[PDB]
Amino acid sequence: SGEAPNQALLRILKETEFKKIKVLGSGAFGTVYKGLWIPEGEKVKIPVAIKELREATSPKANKEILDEAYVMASVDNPHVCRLLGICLTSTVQLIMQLMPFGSLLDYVREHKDNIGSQYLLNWCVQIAKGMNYLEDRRLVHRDLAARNVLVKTPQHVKITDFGLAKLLGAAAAEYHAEGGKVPIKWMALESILHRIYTHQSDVWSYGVTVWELMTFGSKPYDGIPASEISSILEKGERLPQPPICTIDVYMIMVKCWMIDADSRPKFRELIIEFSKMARDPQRYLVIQGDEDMDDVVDADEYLIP
Ligand SMILES: COc1cc(N2CCC(N)CC2)ccc1Nc1ncc(C(=O)OC(C)C)c(-c2cn(C)c3ccccc23)n1
Q: Is 43 exposed, middle or buried (0-12, 13-18, 19+ CB in 10 A)?
Protein backbone atom coordinates (compact mmCIF):
# COMPACT_ATOMS: atom_id res chain seq x y z
CA SER A 1 0.00 0.00 0.00
CA GLY A 2 0.90 3.69 -0.25
CA GLU A 3 0.37 6.99 1.53
CA ALA A 4 -2.49 9.41 0.89
CA PRO A 5 -2.14 13.21 0.83
CA ASN A 6 -2.69 15.09 4.10
CA GLN A 7 -5.15 17.91 3.35
CA ALA A 8 -5.40 19.15 6.94
CA LEU A 9 -5.82 22.91 7.31
CA LEU A 10 -3.70 25.18 9.51
CA ARG A 11 -5.35 28.40 10.63
CA ILE A 12 -3.34 31.51 11.54
CA LEU A 13 -4.99 33.76 14.13
CA LYS A 14 -4.36 37.40 14.97
CA GLU A 15 -3.17 38.42 18.43
CA THR A 16 -6.07 40.88 18.65
CA GLU A 17 -8.83 38.28 18.41
CA PHE A 18 -7.98 36.32 21.57
CA LYS A 19 -7.51 37.54 25.14
CA LYS A 20 -5.46 35.85 27.85
CA ILE A 21 -7.15 35.89 31.23
CA LYS A 22 -5.13 33.86 33.76
CA VAL A 23 -2.10 31.60 34.13
CA LEU A 24 -2.69 27.84 34.35
CA GLY A 25 0.96 26.77 34.48
CA SER A 26 4.52 27.94 33.98
CA GLY A 27 7.77 26.18 33.23
CA ALA A 28 10.52 25.58 30.70
CA PHE A 29 7.94 25.07 27.94
CA GLY A 30 6.89 28.67 28.55
CA THR A 31 3.57 29.88 29.95
CA VAL A 32 0.08 28.46 29.37
CA TYR A 33 -2.87 30.84 29.73
CA LYS A 34 -6.59 30.38 30.03
CA GLY A 35 -8.33 32.66 27.56
CA LEU A 36 -11.18 33.33 25.17
CA TRP A 37 -10.91 33.35 21.38
CA ILE A 38 -13.33 35.43 19.30
CA PRO A 39 -13.08 34.82 15.53
CA GLU A 40 -13.62 38.22 13.95
CA GLY A 41 -17.13 38.62 12.58
CA GLU A 42 -18.32 35.15 13.63
CA LYS A 43 -20.23 35.96 16.85
CA VAL A 44 -18.78 33.10 18.92
CA LYS A 45 -16.61 32.92 22.03
CA ILE A 46 -14.41 29.83 22.27
CA PRO A 47 -12.67 29.11 25.62
CA VAL A 48 -9.05 28.33 24.79
CA ALA A 49 -5.74 27.49 26.39
CA ILE A 50 -2.92 29.59 24.93
CA LYS A 51 0.73 28.54 25.22
CA GLU A 52 3.58 30.90 24.39
CA LEU A 53 7.26 29.99 24.47
CA ARG A 54 9.20 31.46 27.39
CA GLU A 55 12.07 32.95 25.35
CA ALA A 56 11.61 34.50 21.92
CA THR A 57 15.24 33.77 20.96
CA SER A 58 15.22 29.96 21.07
CA PRO A 59 15.65 28.51 17.57
CA LYS A 60 15.33 24.84 18.56
CA ALA A 61 12.09 25.51 20.45
CA ASN A 62 10.30 27.20 17.54
CA LYS A 63 11.20 24.35 15.19
CA GLU A 64 9.99 21.85 17.80
CA ILE A 65 6.73 23.64 18.65
CA LEU A 66 5.79 24.02 14.98
CA ASP A 67 6.37 20.27 14.70
CA GLU A 68 3.72 19.77 17.39
CA ALA A 69 1.31 22.09 15.57
CA TYR A 70 1.87 20.09 12.38
CA VAL A 71 0.91 16.85 14.15
CA MET A 72 -2.11 18.25 16.00
CA ALA A 73 -3.42 20.00 12.88
CA SER A 74 -3.57 16.60 11.18
CA VAL A 75 -5.70 14.76 13.77
CA ASP A 76 -9.50 15.03 14.13
CA ASN A 77 -11.02 12.59 16.64
CA PRO A 78 -13.36 12.97 19.66
CA HIS A 79 -10.64 11.53 21.92
CA VAL A 80 -7.57 13.38 20.64
CA CYS A 81 -6.90 17.01 21.56
CA ARG A 82 -8.06 19.74 19.18
CA LEU A 83 -5.76 22.45 17.83
CA LEU A 84 -7.53 25.71 17.01
CA GLY A 85 -4.71 27.73 15.47
CA ILE A 86 -1.34 29.38 15.92
CA CYS A 87 -0.27 32.99 16.17
CA LEU A 88 3.04 34.13 14.69
CA THR A 89 3.99 36.90 17.10
CA SER A 90 7.51 37.60 18.37
CA THR A 91 6.99 34.65 20.71
CA VAL A 92 5.08 32.06 18.70
CA GLN A 93 2.00 30.76 20.51
CA LEU A 94 -0.50 28.05 19.64
CA ILE A 95 -4.13 27.92 20.71
CA MET A 96 -5.79 24.73 21.93
CA GLN A 97 -9.19 23.74 23.28
CA LEU A 98 -9.51 24.37 27.01
CA MET A 99 -9.76 21.22 29.13
CA PRO A 100 -11.25 22.56 32.38
CA PHE A 101 -10.27 19.66 34.65
CA GLY A 102 -6.56 19.49 33.89
CA SER A 103 -4.64 16.29 33.38
CA LEU A 104 -6.21 12.94 34.22
CA LEU A 105 -3.25 12.07 36.46
CA ASP A 106 -3.92 15.05 38.73
CA TYR A 107 -7.66 14.29 38.60
CA VAL A 108 -7.52 10.75 39.99
CA ARG A 109 -5.07 11.98 42.63
CA GLU A 110 -7.36 14.84 43.71
CA HIS A 111 -10.49 12.65 43.62
CA LYS A 112 -9.16 9.26 44.70
CA ASP A 113 -11.85 9.25 47.40
CA ASN A 114 -14.91 8.94 45.11
CA ILE A 115 -14.08 7.71 41.60
CA GLY A 116 -16.33 4.89 40.44
CA SER A 117 -15.31 1.76 38.59
CA GLN A 118 -17.33 2.86 35.55
CA TYR A 119 -15.34 6.08 35.11
CA LEU A 120 -12.06 4.16 35.21
CA LEU A 121 -13.23 1.64 32.62
CA ASN A 122 -14.77 4.27 30.33
CA TRP A 123 -11.48 6.20 30.44
CA CYS A 124 -9.60 3.06 29.38
CA VAL A 125 -11.97 2.73 26.42
CA GLN A 126 -11.73 6.37 25.35
CA ILE A 127 -7.92 6.34 25.52
CA ALA A 128 -7.88 3.15 23.46
CA LYS A 129 -10.15 4.83 20.92
CA GLY A 130 -7.76 7.76 20.61
CA MET A 131 -4.73 5.50 20.24
CA ASN A 132 -6.47 3.36 17.61
CA TYR A 133 -7.14 6.52 15.61
CA LEU A 134 -3.48 7.55 15.75
CA GLU A 135 -2.51 4.07 14.57
CA ASP A 136 -4.89 4.48 11.62
CA ARG A 137 -3.18 7.79 10.85
CA ARG A 138 0.23 6.01 11.01
CA LEU A 139 1.12 8.22 13.99
CA VAL A 140 3.27 7.03 16.90
CA HIS A 141 2.71 8.98 20.10
CA ARG A 142 5.88 7.89 21.98
CA ASP A 143 4.78 9.68 25.18
CA LEU A 144 1.48 8.12 26.24
CA ALA A 145 1.08 8.54 30.00
CA ALA A 146 -1.66 9.51 32.42
CA ARG A 147 -0.10 12.98 32.68
CA ASN A 148 -0.66 13.41 28.92
CA VAL A 149 -4.43 12.83 29.05
CA LEU A 150 -6.57 15.94 29.51
CA VAL A 151 -10.10 15.95 30.92
CA LYS A 152 -12.88 17.88 29.18
CA THR A 153 -15.60 16.53 31.50
CA PRO A 154 -15.33 13.62 33.95
CA GLN A 155 -16.96 11.51 31.22
CA HIS A 156 -14.79 12.70 28.30
CA VAL A 157 -10.98 12.55 28.13
CA LYS A 158 -8.49 13.32 25.35
CA ILE A 159 -4.89 12.51 24.42
CA THR A 160 -2.34 15.31 24.05
CA ASP A 161 1.38 16.23 24.20
CA PHE A 162 2.65 15.31 20.72
CA GLY A 163 6.08 16.87 21.25
CA LEU A 164 7.65 13.45 20.69
CA ALA A 165 5.14 12.04 18.18
CA LYS A 166 6.38 10.88 14.77
CA LEU A 167 4.47 10.06 11.59
CA LEU A 168 5.51 6.59 10.40
CA GLY A 169 6.78 7.02 6.86
CA ALA A 170 5.43 5.22 3.82
CA ALA A 171 6.27 1.49 3.91
CA ALA A 172 7.99 1.84 7.30
CA ALA A 173 7.22 -0.13 10.46
CA GLU A 174 9.58 1.37 13.09
CA TYR A 175 10.96 4.81 13.90
CA HIS A 176 14.55 4.15 15.06
CA ALA A 177 15.09 7.29 17.10
CA GLU A 178 18.50 8.92 16.98
CA GLY A 179 18.44 9.77 20.68
CA GLY A 180 17.29 12.31 23.23
CA LYS A 181 15.49 12.64 26.58
CA VAL A 182 12.77 10.06 27.20
CA PRO A 183 10.41 8.80 29.96
CA ILE A 184 11.80 5.38 30.81
CA LYS A 185 9.11 3.96 33.13
CA TRP A 186 6.54 4.06 30.29
CA MET A 187 8.74 2.73 27.47
CA ALA A 188 8.76 -0.74 25.96
CA LEU A 189 11.95 -2.75 26.37
CA GLU A 190 12.72 -2.63 22.64
CA SER A 191 12.60 1.17 22.78
CA ILE A 192 14.91 1.30 25.82
CA LEU A 193 17.73 -0.80 24.38
CA HIS A 194 17.42 -0.08 20.66
CA ARG A 195 15.54 3.25 20.36
CA ILE A 196 12.91 1.48 18.21
CA TYR A 197 9.36 2.81 18.51
CA THR A 198 6.27 1.21 16.94
CA HIS A 199 2.52 1.23 17.46
CA GLN A 200 3.15 -1.79 19.68
CA SER A 201 5.57 0.33 21.72
CA ASP A 202 2.66 2.64 22.55
CA VAL A 203 0.58 -0.37 23.63
CA TRP A 204 3.22 -1.01 26.29
CA SER A 205 2.85 2.60 27.45
CA TYR A 206 -0.92 2.09 27.39
CA GLY A 207 -0.47 -0.74 29.87
CA VAL A 208 1.45 1.49 32.27
CA THR A 209 -1.12 4.28 31.84
CA VAL A 210 -3.93 1.92 32.86
CA TRP A 211 -1.78 0.91 35.82
CA GLU A 212 -1.57 4.56 36.92
CA LEU A 213 -5.37 4.80 36.94
CA MET A 214 -5.96 1.51 38.76
CA THR A 215 -3.49 2.61 41.46
CA PHE A 216 -5.11 6.09 41.65
CA GLY A 217 -1.97 7.87 40.49
CA SER A 218 0.85 5.81 41.95
CA LYS A 219 4.34 6.19 40.56
CA PRO A 220 5.61 3.16 38.61
CA TYR A 221 8.75 1.43 39.91
CA ASP A 222 8.86 3.96 42.74
CA GLY A 223 12.32 4.24 44.28
CA ILE A 224 14.04 2.34 41.44
CA PRO A 225 16.60 4.17 39.26
CA ALA A 226 15.80 4.33 35.56
CA SER A 227 19.28 2.93 34.90
CA GLU A 228 18.31 -0.41 36.45
CA ILE A 229 14.90 -0.53 34.74
CA SER A 230 16.13 -2.39 31.66
CA SER A 231 17.74 -5.28 33.54
CA ILE A 232 14.53 -5.72 35.55
CA LEU A 233 12.32 -6.31 32.51
CA GLU A 234 14.86 -8.64 30.90
CA LYS A 235 14.74 -10.89 33.97
CA GLY A 236 10.97 -11.06 33.54
CA GLU A 237 9.67 -8.75 36.27
CA ARG A 238 6.74 -6.34 35.80
CA LEU A 239 4.48 -4.02 37.79
CA PRO A 240 2.40 -5.60 40.58
CA GLN A 241 -1.34 -6.20 40.52
CA PRO A 242 -3.31 -3.16 41.81
CA PRO A 243 -5.46 -4.12 44.81
CA ILE A 244 -8.74 -3.21 43.06
CA CYS A 245 -8.07 -5.11 39.83
CA THR A 246 -9.67 -8.45 39.27
CA ILE A 247 -7.51 -10.98 37.43
CA ASP A 248 -9.40 -10.14 34.24
CA VAL A 249 -8.21 -6.53 34.13
CA TYR A 250 -4.66 -7.33 35.27
CA MET A 251 -4.31 -10.07 32.64
CA ILE A 252 -4.83 -7.53 29.86
CA MET A 253 -2.21 -5.05 31.01
CA VAL A 254 0.27 -7.91 31.50
CA LYS A 255 -0.20 -8.86 27.83
CA CYS A 256 0.75 -5.23 27.09
CA TRP A 257 4.16 -5.92 28.68
CA MET A 258 5.32 -8.95 26.71
CA ILE A 259 8.73 -8.54 25.13
CA ASP A 260 7.61 -9.82 21.71
CA ALA A 261 5.74 -6.77 20.44
CA ASP A 262 3.89 -8.82 17.81
CA SER A 263 2.18 -10.87 20.55
CA ARG A 264 1.03 -7.81 22.50
CA PRO A 265 -2.58 -6.64 22.04
CA LYS A 266 -3.67 -4.00 19.56
CA PHE A 267 -5.67 -0.90 20.40
CA ARG A 268 -8.58 -2.18 18.31
CA GLU A 269 -8.69 -5.22 20.58
CA LEU A 270 -8.29 -3.24 23.80
CA ILE A 271 -11.41 -1.22 22.91
CA ILE A 272 -13.52 -4.38 22.68
CA GLU A 273 -12.26 -5.95 25.90
CA PHE A 274 -12.70 -2.80 28.00
CA SER A 275 -16.02 -2.02 26.32
CA LYS A 276 -17.21 -5.45 27.45
CA MET A 277 -16.06 -4.80 31.01
CA ALA A 278 -17.78 -1.40 31.11
CA ARG A 279 -21.11 -3.22 30.81
CA ASP A 280 -20.75 -4.48 34.41
CA PRO A 281 -17.99 -2.46 36.09
CA GLN A 282 -18.27 -3.92 39.59
CA ARG A 283 -17.44 -7.42 38.31
CA TYR A 284 -13.94 -6.28 37.29
CA LEU A 285 -13.00 -3.57 39.82
CA VAL A 286 -13.76 -3.91 43.53
CA ILE A 287 -13.60 -0.40 45.01
CA GLN A 288 -14.74 0.24 48.58
CA GLY A 289 -18.13 1.95 48.37
CA ASP A 290 -17.97 2.98 44.72
CA GLU A 291 -21.76 2.83 44.22
CA ASP A 292 -20.83 37.60 29.31
CA MET A 293 -21.23 33.92 28.45
CA ASP A 294 -24.19 34.15 26.05
CA ASP A 295 -22.25 33.41 22.85
CA VAL A 296 -19.82 30.84 24.25
CA VAL A 297 -19.32 27.74 22.11
CA ASP A 298 -17.15 24.73 22.88
CA ALA A 299 -14.36 24.06 20.39
CA ASP A 300 -15.95 20.71 19.53
CA GLU A 301 -18.90 22.60 18.00
CA TYR A 302 -16.75 25.19 16.19
CA LEU A 303 -15.81 23.25 13.09
CA ILE A 304 -13.46 24.72 10.49
CA PRO A 305 -14.65 25.32 6.86
C1 LIG B 1 -9.14 25.14 33.74
O2 LIG B 1 -8.18 24.82 32.84
C3 LIG B 1 -7.11 24.11 33.36
C4 LIG B 1 -6.72 24.25 34.71
C5 LIG B 1 -5.62 23.52 35.19
N6 LIG B 1 -5.20 23.66 36.64
C7 LIG B 1 -3.82 24.33 36.87
C8 LIG B 1 -3.45 24.51 38.37
C9 LIG B 1 -4.53 25.04 39.18
N10 LIG B 1 -4.77 26.42 38.74
C11 LIG B 1 -5.82 24.31 39.07
C12 LIG B 1 -6.31 24.12 37.61
C13 LIG B 1 -4.87 22.66 34.34
C14 LIG B 1 -5.25 22.53 32.99
C15 LIG B 1 -6.36 23.26 32.49
N16 LIG B 1 -6.80 23.14 31.08
C17 LIG B 1 -5.87 22.97 29.94
N18 LIG B 1 -6.39 23.00 28.71
C19 LIG B 1 -5.66 22.86 27.69
C20 LIG B 1 -4.27 22.68 27.88
C21 LIG B 1 -3.32 22.53 26.58
O22 LIG B 1 -3.66 21.80 25.62
O23 LIG B 1 -2.14 23.26 26.57
C24 LIG B 1 -1.59 23.60 25.28
C25 LIG B 1 -1.97 25.06 24.99
C26 LIG B 1 -0.10 23.41 25.41
C27 LIG B 1 -3.75 22.66 29.17
C28 LIG B 1 -2.24 22.47 29.51
C29 LIG B 1 -1.25 21.68 28.77
N30 LIG B 1 -0.07 21.77 29.41
C31 LIG B 1 1.18 21.12 28.96
C32 LIG B 1 -0.21 22.59 30.58
C33 LIG B 1 0.72 22.99 31.58
C34 LIG B 1 0.33 23.79 32.60
C35 LIG B 1 -1.05 24.23 32.67
C36 LIG B 1 -1.96 23.84 31.69
C37 LIG B 1 -1.56 23.03 30.66
N38 LIG B 1 -4.57 22.81 30.15
A: exposed
